[PDB]
């Protein structure tokens, strides 16, 4: 009764082929979910699985034409779609999937349930994922050297651990972390450790992600970060000297959005999943073209203050304020880092940090107080309140302060607002900032006179 | 028993077809791994290999349809992907692969294991790969002429040997060596020697690679090369005279990165991979538009100070300090070099130098100390030092020196800073860098009162 | 072959340039009626095209083609009535 249809039915019953919402077919060969957009692997799966069928169903699969017929039957049988990479608390390896919430490993059919189409690229060794080891002791030593456990560094160390451990979660992240510090401070060492720990889920780019537009035409900048769990940008083009493109606000706001638009070469797909924890490496204060209240909620900063120097230049390092601790540089450290000596020790440390911060809901919080650019806009929300629905039986006293009543709305003339705001802040230090706000927020009662729909919280306190 | 499946199994057992990460197949026909994207060569391989199979399979493999069926079976059988060009310490020739570490030459099935697609383009003659020959003596004399073995030139000679010997590898070497020497100093002799030694793995490029943006649109000069092992640029226009584009630091940074942004004409495949040992030939000091910390980590210099001039213009050449020593020029040397007379002698010399520097990890050390343009960022870093946390309990003695104590920070005025900094480095040569330092490393309590948190090392050393 | 002055007073790379790819294996190129520079409003003779036409390989593509490298066997003769000028 159509032997090839029965073969297709059995292969479908093994649940080794799935149809995805994007239109592709994902197959389960060699204990991984593989797919190819312009070259289906269904016939490869049929040939490989021919060993699990009865004796008479195996000799029919040695002909390419019969395998093509079986593939046609299978394609007609698949009507409903499934979703791939929908578990954010699973870390996929080459030979299994590791459970972050608990810590046990899976293999074969155990890992088959989670449809993970990406992997770190290296096998998971169970004999090295242990708490006690000399490699773990050395890793703890170097990590403690990078970020001392002193009291003043408690919050910075905790933020460092949180940011590093968030690279194991396969979901969308709501913040961008800036790694601020001088050269040869440990950012490169941490980057290499993270790369060694998370394999192929880690990608490295340049500064073009931030300062360049994302739409263009066929853009591989954003299409490359499909399902990547960590994105690293290094060697930022210092903006102290004029001529360097500023960090676009639209780029920062778009890199946090769950659904991003961009296509690679020879592709019609502009939809990719954003699972990346974007970390930007820099040595100097970043600047932005335009600062607003929304962009201030997507920035976090980690500070590095431990410099490794040669014995000849040890005195110069000790005579610098930027470095709080001076240690001895090791030349072969890069050697054993790239030799994957500390890979599983760092993986165990990352999983421990995750379990420490694996509360039912995970989230990333911004710290705008560490950015000098945000200093102006941070106080301005604490001093000015827009003309609103909480003021109208107060214009009797507010009139003497300079506020005038217009269409039952409290306003403020330009001169009075200027002379009120010049008292709080220097007219020369924040002159550009004040001028920018004034040009961005004047209204025109007429052609000449201008007013502002803002009132001072201090005058509210004053009777 | 499906004879064609058995034929495909045997052909797969001979290990002659491999699947690559790009979705292409590489076959082994006539002692070379060759691929072809738009027309696979698996059927050519089947017809060629029909001789090693038994008679009953050779008789079958004479039909194009049966060859197509066997190719389909082979394509279904290949699931795993393979690595290509992953051995830095191997030098591929037209008829084998040379092992640099050991010195043993392979041929055919011996060279099969190292999946090398590119080659030098010429065969290997083990008869001429000997240490004892008159050609070797002449080459050694010429080398001693070009780079003498004097004590004063020991470091320069060692750096020259390292840079020349690095041309045979594909490992990590992120430095750009500058061949500093005036015209007719003998650098062209070394260039022609290297070209004749390494064949097709050598590429000559112009000025555009250092002063024009690599990304742009279609660009072959940065993307036409692929797995090239040495890049040489000469006839460089002078950057000392205004009117020519300077050596942009962004291009130097881009020429060594694990990411490529740039494509050739009508080539969507923008993916290339190598860090070729780029040697820069110039008769004048380099000039960069922007200089920072990153640039000084990827620059090296080699000096040539030997001249060959005709007797007619000998007086003018001797009256020019462009060369330390004036010698006699050779006319037939260019023809002898073209005739590939010293090819294998120079190959043996390069192999000997590599074996001398064949430590498990070979890397290039930048030497920015010999570039006058980078002098400002070196000496000031070793001389001007800021305050420190350890400088708190020494302000009592520091006050009489002419300093003040403010929030545990030692400050100095601006005019005095300019006057003192005009002595070490003149503002004529590094005024922009001086002003960048001033605006980067100064703090303000008020705009009128400008203070800079730096203590001169002269006052520190003097009690 | 006979060609216009686009090979002299226009960039060879540009986009589609049949004038630089139709000369594949041609042994002689003749361009006549030069727009002399005595009349202001005419593009000068670029040196880049001059040095590109002398190299063994000249970069350029034909219309609806995927080939860039073409052999240069041409003896280029430029016909003019007044003095050429160079930028």
φ, ψ for residue B73, nearest 5 deg: -60, -45
- d(CA A49, CA A70) in angstroms, rounded, equals 12
- d(CA C22, CA A187) in angstroms, rounded, equals 55
The answer to whether residues B243 and B203 touch, using CB atoms and an 8 Å cutoff, is no
Q: Is A121 on the interface with B (CB under 8 A)?
A: no
DSSP letter string, A356-390 = HT--SS------GGG-GGGHHHHHHTTTEEES-SS
Q: Tokens for A257?
A: 């959005």
Q: Tokens for A98?
A: 């590791």
The answer to whether residues A284 and A373 touch, using CB atoms and an 8 Å cutoff, is no
From the list A64, A220, A335, which residue is nearest B72 (CB)?
A: A64
* Angle, CA A331 vertex, CA A330 and CA A333 arms, to 5°: 70
Cβ–Cβ contacts within 10 Å for residue A127, how many?
A: 7
Sole residue written with tokens 């343009």: B373
Q: How far is CA A455 from CA A43, A424, A426, B44, C23, in A?
A: 72, 14, 20, 83, 75
- d(CA B432, CA B166) in angstroms, rounded, equals 37
Detail the DSSP E strand segments found in A48-117. 90-92, 97-99
Detail the DSSP E strand segments found in A259-319. 259-261, 271-273, 277-282, 299-304, 306-309
- d(CA A255, CA A202) in angstroms, rounded, equals 16
Selected residue of B37, B69, B78, B79 to mutate for chain A interface (largest A Cβ count, 10 A)? B79
- d(CA A390, CA A388) in angstroms, rounded, equals 6
Question: What strands, in cross-sheet order, belong to the sheet with A443-444?
Answer: A404-406, A409-413, A450-452, A443-444
- d(CA B272, CA B226) in angstroms, rounded, equals 6
β-strands A450-452, A443-444 pairing: antiparallel
Helix (H) or strand (E) holding B11, with range, is helix B3-13
Helix, strand, coil distribution of chain A in percent, nearest 5: 40, 15, 45
Q: How far is CA A52 from CA A11, A13, A106, B6, B225, in A?
A: 9, 12, 22, 20, 48
Q: Tokens for B363?
A: 């890397």
Question: What does the DSSP 8-state code read for residue A310?
Answer: -
Cβ–Cβ contacts within 10 Å for residue A50, how many?
A: 17
Query: Quick check: C61 and B266 CB within 8 A?
Result: yes
Exposure string of B136-154, with b = 16+ CB inside 10 Å and e = fewer, is beebeebbeebbbeeeeee
- d(CA C36, CA B60) in angstroms, rounded, equals 71
- Chain B, 258 to 317: residues with Cβ < 8 Å from chain A are 258-259, 261, 268-270, 290, 292-294
Q: Of how many residues is chain B composed?
A: 463
Exposure string of A254-263, with b = 16+ CB inside 10 Å and e = fewer, is bbbeeebebb
Question: What does the DSSP 8-state code read for residue A331?
Answer: S
Detail the DSSP E strand segments found in A376-453. 384-386, 404-406, 409-413, 443-444, 450-452
DSSP letter string, B160-205 = HHHHHHGGG--S----EEEEE--TTSSHHHHHHHHHHHHGGGEEEE
- d(CA A165, CA A158) in angstroms, rounded, equals 11
Contacts for A49 with CB less than 8 Å, ≥ 6 apart: A11, A14, A16
Residues of C in contact with B220 (CB under 8 A): 59
- d(CA B201, CA B274) in angstroms, rounded, equals 12
Sole residue written with tokens 């490393």: B441
Q: Tokens for B32?
A: 């070379």
Question: What does the DSSP 8-state code read for residue B376?
Answer: H
Contacts for B322 with CB less than 8 Å, ≥ 6 apart: B182, B183, B185, B307
Among the listed residues B356, B388, B386, B376, the one whose alpha carbon sits nearest the alpha carbon of residue B435: B376
- d(CA A390, CA A401) in angstroms, rounded, equals 17
The answer to whether residues C67 and C20 touch, using CB atoms and an 8 Å cutoff, is no
- d(CA B255, CA B271) in angstroms, rounded, equals 14
Query: Quick check: A48 and B79 CB within 8 A?
Result: yes
Residues of C in contact with B266 (CB under 8 A): 61, 66, 68
Cβ–Cβ contacts within 10 Å for residue B445, how many?
A: 12
Sole residue written with tokens 């130097």: B252
- The residue in chain B having the minimum alpha-carbon distance to the alpha carbon of residue A265 is B268
The answer to whether residues B226 and B197 touch, using CB atoms and an 8 Å cutoff, is no
Helix (H) or strand (E) holding B239, with range, is none
Q: Cα–chain-centroid distance for residue B459?
A: 44
Contacts for B154 with CB less than 8 Å, ≥ 6 apart: none
φ, ψ for residue B250, nearest 5 deg: -65, -40
Among the listed residues B285, B99, B52, the one whose alpha carbon sits nearest the alpha carbon of residue B179: B285
φ, ψ for residue A420, nearest 5 deg: -75, -35
Burial environment of residue B420 by CB neighbours within 10 A (0 to 12, 13 to 18, 19 or more):
middle
- d(CA A74, CA B150) in angstroms, rounded, equals 78
Cβ–Cβ contacts within 10 Å for residue B297, how many?
A: 14
The answer to whether residues B34 and B41 touch, using CB atoms and an 8 Å cutoff, is yes
CB–CB contacts below 8 A, A to B = 75
Shortest Cα–Cα distance, B241 to chain C (Å): 19
* Positive or negative torsion for Cα A233, B436, A306, A155: negative
Q: How far is CA B154 from CA A387, A390, B148, B150, B278, in A?
A: 78, 82, 9, 6, 23
- d(CA A347, CA A349) in angstroms, rounded, equals 5
Helix (H) or strand (E) holding A263, with range, is none
Q: Tokens for B92?
A: 């591929």
* Positive or negative torsion for Cα B179, B184, B187, B191: positive
- d(CA A90, CA A201) in angstroms, rounded, equals 13
Q: What is the resolution of this structure in A?
A: 2.9
Contacts for A148 with CB less than 8 Å, ≥ 6 apart: A157, A306, A324, A325
- d(CA B163, CA A254) in angstroms, rounded, equals 45
- d(CA B191, CA B236) in angstroms, rounded, equals 15
- d(CA A24, CA C12) in angstroms, rounded, equals 44
Sole residue written with tokens 């430029």: C78
Contacts for B57 with CB less than 8 Å, ≥ 6 apart: B3, B6, B7, B10, B50
- The residue in chain A having the minimum alpha-carbon distance to the alpha carbon of residue B408 is A321
The answer to whether residues A223 and A274 touch, using CB atoms and an 8 Å cutoff, is no
Q: How far is CA B35 from CA B84, B95, B220, in A?
A: 12, 17, 21
Cβ–Cβ contacts within 10 Å for residue A376, how many?
A: 17
Burial environment of residue B10 by CB neighbours within 10 A (0 to 12, 13 to 18, 19 or more):
middle
Contacts for B312 with CB less than 8 Å, ≥ 6 apart: none
β-strands A176-181, A299-304 pairing: parallel
The answer to whether residues A314 and A382 touch, using CB atoms and an 8 Å cutoff, is no
Question: What does the DSSP 8-state code read for residue B364?
Answer: P
The answer to whether residues B283 and B236 touch, using CB atoms and an 8 Å cutoff, is yes
Sole residue written with tokens 């727009």: C35
- d(CA B179, CA B303) in angstroms, rounded, equals 6
Contacts for B16 with CB less than 8 Å, ≥ 6 apart: B27, B28, B45, B49
* Angle, CA B243 vertex, CA B239 and CA B247 arms, to 5°: 40
Q: Is C63 on the interface with B (CB under 8 A)?
A: no
Q: Tokens for A291?
A: 């600062």
Shortest Cα–Cα distance, A268 to chain B (Å): 14
Residues of A in contact with B436 (CB under 8 A): 240-241
φ, ψ for residue B453, nearest 5 deg: -85, 75
- d(CA B30, CA B193) in angstroms, rounded, equals 29
Burial environment of residue A421 by CB neighbours within 10 A (0 to 12, 13 to 18, 19 or more):
buried
- d(CA B155, CA B164) in angstroms, rounded, equals 14
Helix (H) or strand (E) holding B244, with range, is none
Residue A82: strand, helix, or coil:
strand
Shortest Cα–Cα distance, A449 to chain B (Å): 31
* Cross-strand bridge partners of residue A278: A231
- d(CA A365, CA A299) in angstroms, rounded, equals 8
* Cross-strand bridge partners of residue A452: A412
Query: Quick check: A241 and B444 CB within 8 A?
Result: no
Q: How far is CA B442 from CA A65, A91, A182, B167, B292, in A?
A: 77, 47, 17, 46, 19
- d(CA B263, CA B216) in angstroms, rounded, equals 9
Question: What does the DSSP 8-state code read for residue A49?
Answer: H
Residues of A in contact with B292 (CB under 8 A): 238
Among the listed residues B90, B159, B103, B163, the one whose alpha carbon sits nearest the alpha carbon of residue B129: B103
The runs of H, that is alpha helices, within B22-94 are 42-49, 55-58, 64-77
- d(CA B280, CA B94) in angstroms, rounded, equals 29
Among the listed residues A83, A94, A153, the one whose alpha carbon sits nearest the alpha carbon of residue A119: A94
Cβ–Cβ contacts within 10 Å for residue B161, how many?
A: 20
- d(CA A102, CA A121) in angstroms, rounded, equals 22
Helix (H) or strand (E) holding B137, with range, is helix B134-146
Among the listed residues A199, A25, A29, A1, the one whose alpha carbon sits nearest the alpha carbon of residue A112: A29
Cβ–Cβ contacts within 10 Å for residue B82, how many?
A: 14
Cβ–Cβ contacts within 10 Å for residue B215, how many?
A: 16
Q: Tokens for B290?
A: 């922007």
Among the listed residues A112, A301, A125, A304, the one whose alpha carbon sits nearest the alpha carbon of residue A199: A125
- d(CA A301, CA C86) in angstroms, rounded, equals 56
- d(CA A311, CA A189) in angstroms, rounded, equals 20
Cβ–Cβ contacts within 10 Å for residue A8, how many?
A: 22
Contacts for A450 with CB less than 8 Å, ≥ 6 apart: A413, A414, A442, A443, A444
- d(CA B342, CA B140) in angstroms, rounded, equals 10
Q: How far is CA A81 from CA A78, A87, B187, in A?
A: 8, 17, 66
φ, ψ for residue A105, nearest 5 deg: -100, 155
Query: Quick check: B266 and C59 CB within 8 A?
Result: no
- d(CA B461, CA A316) in angstroms, rounded, equals 13
Q: Are A and B touching by the rule of 3+ CB pairs within 8 Å? A: yes
The answer to whether residues B73 and B67 touch, using CB atoms and an 8 Å cutoff, is no
The answer to whether residues B187 and B181 touch, using CB atoms and an 8 Å cutoff, is yes
Q: How far is CA B173 from CA A98, B276, C41, in A?
A: 36, 8, 52
Among the listed residues A180, A428, A381, A211, the one whose alpha carbon sits nearest the alpha carbon of residue A282: A180
DSSP letter string, B287-304 = -BS---TTGGGSEEEEE-
Contacts for B411 with CB less than 8 Å, ≥ 6 apart: B403, B404, B451, B452, B453
Cβ–Cβ contacts within 10 Å for residue A55, how many?
A: 6
The answer to whether residues B179 and B279 touch, using CB atoms and an 8 Å cutoff, is yes
Task: Give, rounded to a whole angstrom, the gap between the first and last alpha carbons of chain B.
Answer: 97
Helices (H) and strands (E) in chain B, counts: 19, 18
Query: Quick check: A316 and B387 CB within 8 A?
Result: no
Sole residue written with tokens 């088959």: A112
Helix, strand, coil distribution of chain C in percent, nearest 5: 15, 20, 65
Residue B24: strand, helix, or coil:
coil
Exposure string of B389-414, with b = 16+ CB inside 10 Å and e = fewer, is eebeeebeebeeeebeeeeebbbbee
DSSP letter string, B374-408 = GHHHHHHHHHEEE--GGGGGGHHHHHTTT-EEETT
β-strands C76-78, C29-31 pairing: parallel
Helix (H) or strand (E) holding B328, with range, is strand B325-328
* Cross-strand bridge partners of residue B73: none
The answer to whether residues A11 and A91 touch, using CB atoms and an 8 Å cutoff, is no
Selected residue of A241, A312, A335 to mutate for chain B interface (largest B Cβ count, 10 A)? A241
């Amino acid at each position: 009764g159509n032997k090839l249809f029965n073969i297709a039915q059995r292969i479908l019953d093994t649940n080794s082929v799935l149809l995805t919402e994007r239109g592709d077919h994902i197959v389960w060969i060699n204990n991984s979910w593989k797919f190819n957009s312009e070259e289906p692997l269904i016939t490869k799966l049929i040939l490989s699985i021919r060993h699990q069928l009865p004796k008479e169903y195996s000799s029919e699969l040695l002909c390419p034409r019969k395998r093509k017929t079986v593939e046609a039957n299978i394609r007609d049988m698949l009507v409903d779609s499934v979703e791939t990479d929908t578990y954010p608390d699973k870390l996929p390896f080459k030979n299994g999937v590791l459970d972050l919430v608990d810590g046990m490993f899976y293999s074969g059919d155990d890992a088959k349930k989670y449809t993970c189409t990406v992997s770190t690229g290296f096998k998971f060794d169970d004999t090295k994922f242990v708490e006690d080891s000399p490699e773990m002791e050395e890793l703890m030593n170097i990590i403690n050297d990078i970020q001392p456990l002193t009291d003043e560094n408690k919050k910075n160390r905790e933020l460092y651990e949180k940011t590093l451990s968030s690279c194991l979660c396969g979901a969308t992240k709501g913040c961008l972390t800036f790694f601020f510090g001088e050269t040869a401070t440990g950012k490169s060492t941490t980057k290499r450790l993270l790369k060694s720990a998370i394999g192929d889920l880690f990608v490295e780019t340049g500064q073009t992600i931030l300062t360049d537009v994302l739409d263009k035409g066929p853009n591989p900048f954003i299409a490359n970060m499909h399902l990547k769990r960590s994105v690293f940008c290094s060697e930022l083009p210092d903006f102290a000297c004029s001529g360097s493109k500023k960090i676009r606000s639209d780029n920062i706001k778009k890199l946090t959005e769950p659904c991003v638009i961009g296509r690679p070469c020879f592709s019609n797909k502009i939809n990719n999943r954003n699972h990346a924890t974007i970390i930007i490496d820099t040595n100097y204060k970043p600047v932005f073209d335009r600062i607003d209240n929304a962009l201030m909620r997507r920035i976090a900063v980690v500070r590095f203050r431990t410099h490794f120097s040669q014995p000849s230049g040890r005195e110069a390092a000790e005579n610098n304020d930027a470095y709080d601790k001076v240690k001895l540089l090791d030349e072969g450290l890069d050697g054993k880092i790239q030799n994957n000596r500390y890979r599983f020790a760092f993986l165990y440390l990352l999983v421990k940090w995750y379990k420490k911060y694996h509360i039912p809901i995970m989230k990333l919080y911004p710290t705008p107080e560490e950015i000098p650019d945000f200093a102006f806009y941070l106080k301005i929300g604490t001093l000015l309140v827009s003309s609103s629905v909480k003021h109208i039986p107060l214009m009797t006293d507010l009139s003497k302060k300079g506020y005038i009543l217009y269409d039952n709305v409290v306003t403020l003339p330009l001169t009075t607002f200027q002379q009120k705001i010049s008292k709080y802040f220097n007219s020369r230090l924040f002159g550009h900032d004040i001028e920018s706000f004034i040009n961005r927020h004047k209204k025109f009662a007429n052609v000449s006179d201008e007013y502002l729909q803002y009132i001072f919280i201090e005058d509210i306190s004053s009777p």
